[PDB]
Assembly symmetry: C3
Homo-oligomer: 336 residues x 3
């Protein structure tokens, strides 16, 4: 079980909301799984009015990509901070043990890279985020977080030990954003990342976000970018929030099996209407679709969802089942 | 199990905080349980200073009445929107599957009605609320929500499978309200429902409620309207919050058995001091009273309870038990 | 089991973050455990800029000391309100049954004392706090709360019934503070406790704390006051929040066994990254350290932790384990 003598394999990451190909149950023994990520500081448009955010990312996306391994594997990560960036970064994995999650060993300035290895000995969905000494909250709320999923080697199980299987996995990162407003009542636009600092920290101290978005912008998971599924398919919905609580709900569906604290050695709860992800954690839910149609997935503080942006769509094909729900009489004039 | 061939029965609903008569464990087979609700838009007084709210309700109350059925039954609801109302409404049941909880099939304008049927296949306490496209948060925080309780056919059980029974059930809906203040520092009073819209949405965006009330007003469950019980009685306390988290506590008592996520196929937790209802869900707790006296039931963010209004009273008759608690020496001067 | 015929023993309390000496598993039968606490109203400095708080305490500390007994014991407490204080106080134990937790029987004015006894029949960590009629939120957020820990007579157990043992226990009280700012943008300093009242209640109503501290001040658990442990030691971390939610996280570690609702008759959850303490409750977590180094323990809303103060340090001695984590390549220039 000395990692230096195990087989090494390289994985290619994919952008959210997809998750890279992987096995659930596996017959493999432990290995060293190698990953690479590159930091990207960039301005982005987060809404339909042109509001911008001076963002900081892992691999260009919010959230960063999901990494998937099995309990007992070793994660080997090369973190690259290109010289086009202006700030120093690092990475803290909540799934790792020691040295502030690895943040003490991965401090890279622009133009540097570093390589860390850690044993993934605990199963579950865990957050990873940047955490530079003295600038922690700002790097996290500007985009620097993602999920590491450590599956049990035997796959997911229900409370009685029966196997659970998913057909598709989707990853959703939810981000509370603090965009300053100027004296004319409009959101401010900054020329550089450093310029946004001072106004931004003052808005963070009110504890009131201007916007709360799934995957980088208002409406990111709607229209042509909605998630897709069919009747009879089982989906795994991974949800991460690295700084603030959230309470996910699928309108028209449920959480058939949910790990709200996200740790797969504990039994899941069933039939949930709305579950709770603690700020600084990732959780997971399974659902098998039984009816076709458009579904909304959102934070069930409804003001956060519909006024501030934390909502997305799932578009599901198949045949309608009148035994589960039926319109007995359509809307019509009250009888006189 | 085709609902068109099952026996149909009509139920008469009662106003909160009572719950309509029902069986716990039952020997009946599945049936179609028919209900009717009528929407009422009305101005109400929510506090002792005369502050009003341009409210929207189901059946005239906040919360709407609790509906009770058994797992495997079908719920058939006729929703009536009278022509005295000004807005369109609908209903989303978190306990149902498909068509946005039934909201896509129940869109009624003033002067219309519609009838929906759905299978109640999952046990637990679930929220139901209005959800009109583009106006969701406003209809919910103005009053439009209630609870649907789906009991297991065998009644409630503890973690080891032993039967649990309640003598009385009470339903509490908790509502975060966003009442705008004018330039003189006083709360505004609006002539019509539509006029309150624009100021109200601006207060919702701060995420800071002006008031947080149980059942429609500050002090609704105090004085002559306090809940009542006696020593040795077991009560079921159902608590719903359709938009914001809350953390219920019984001062002087406990939660003997609690389902905080509200889903009866999961084992309850015991001996809780304070539990947690996620915004967009209903939960339930059982308690057997052992001491007489006045008890307070409240949201244990104490500022929310005592400054903003989220607190109520339970008045309990019976005999005091000095083995559980005894005053050894009453307040007296410190000995010199 | 008549408490008047049981053996009585007096315990001497210690200041947080330590906990008074006690047994875990015990062969003793029930007893009456006697404690004394004295109230102290005092001004304190809570940060490095000189900001003061007109505070109210139990025994001079925030939080008050942790009291430890075993399930079935009786707690006998003498509460003393010295005549140097200006206000009336009392105590509500969430672990007790009846008379508003004992608050109806312990109303002491300055110059008075009173003695209460109650059966500790439910195991777990429970909050105790002051609760004077009409002034409840203010006495609690000014400092008046602590934890009562009721251990099972057989000690802590895992979900399968296996014994769990801790080598050290630490108690952390987290306090949301509402310090008013004057017209010059600086925090106000008050000559007396009564003078702070009116400005303070207005800040409480915004629901936005100015500061959120562990054990009385920003940086209380850092530097020479950091908590200490060694590799291989198992620590019990007790965390109380009497008014507002919090979400504890150990950077570089985990919660090996956690009771987030704090009630030891329920099975713990394992491998948690971040857990959740409901406002108005205390919870507990166990962790066995595997790596040496400085660890941070904090509220994982990172703005609350690093901008408002809710963070502390644990300093751990021992030998580094490269099989759990290893730096493969230190930060260096990207290869060209
Ligand atoms: Cl919804
Ligand atoms: Cl209380
Ligand atoms: Cl952290
Ligand atoms: Cu960074
Ligand atoms: Cu973290
Ligand atoms: Cu409506
Ligand atoms: Cu809903
Ligand atoms: Cu007091
Ligand atoms: Cu309390």
């Amino acid at each position: 079980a000395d990692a230096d003598s195990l087989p090494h394999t390289k994985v290619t990451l994919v952008a959210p909301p997809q998750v890279h190909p992987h096995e659930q149950a596996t017959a493999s023994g432990p290995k060293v799984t190698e990953f690479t990520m590159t930091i990207e500081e960039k301005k982005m448009v987060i809404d339909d009015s042109g509001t911008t955010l001076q963002a900081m990312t892992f691999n260009g996306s919010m959230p960063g990509p999901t990494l998937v391994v099995h309990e007992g594997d070793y994660v080997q990560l090369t973190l690259v901070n290109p010289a086009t960036n202006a700030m120093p970064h690092n990475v803290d994995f909540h799934g790792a043990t020691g040295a502030l999650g690895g943040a003490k060993l991965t401090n890279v300035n622009p133009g540097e890279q570093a390589t860390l290895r850690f044993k993934a000995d605990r199963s579950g969905t865990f957050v990873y985020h940047c955490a530079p000494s003295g600038m922690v909250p700002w790097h996290v709320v500007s985009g620097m977080s993602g999920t590491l999923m450590v599956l049990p080697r035997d796959g997911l199980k229900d409370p009685a030990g029966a196997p659970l299987h998913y057909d598709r996995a989707y990853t959703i990162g939810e981000f509370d954003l603090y965009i300053p407003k100027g004296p004319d009542g409009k959101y401010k636009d900054y020329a550089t990342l450093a310029e946004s600092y001072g106004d931004t920290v003052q808005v963070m101290r009110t504890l009131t976000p201007s916007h709360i978005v799934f995957n980088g912008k208002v409406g990111a998971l709607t229209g042509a970018n909605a998630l897709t599924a069919s009747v009879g398919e089982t989906v795994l919905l991974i949800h991460s929030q690295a700084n603030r609580d959230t309470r996910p709900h699928l309108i028209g569906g449920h959480g058939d099996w949910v790990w709200e604290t996200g740790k797969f050695a504990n039994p899941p709860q069933r039939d949930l209407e709305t579950w709770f992800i603690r700020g600084g954690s990732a959780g997971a839910a399974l659902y098998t679709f039984k009816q076709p149609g458009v579904y909304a997935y959102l934070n069930h503080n409804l003001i956060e969802a519909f006024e501030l942006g934390a909502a997305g769509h799932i578009s599901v094909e198949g045949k309608w089942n009148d035994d589960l729900m039926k319109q007995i009489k359509a809307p019509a004039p009250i009888p006189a």
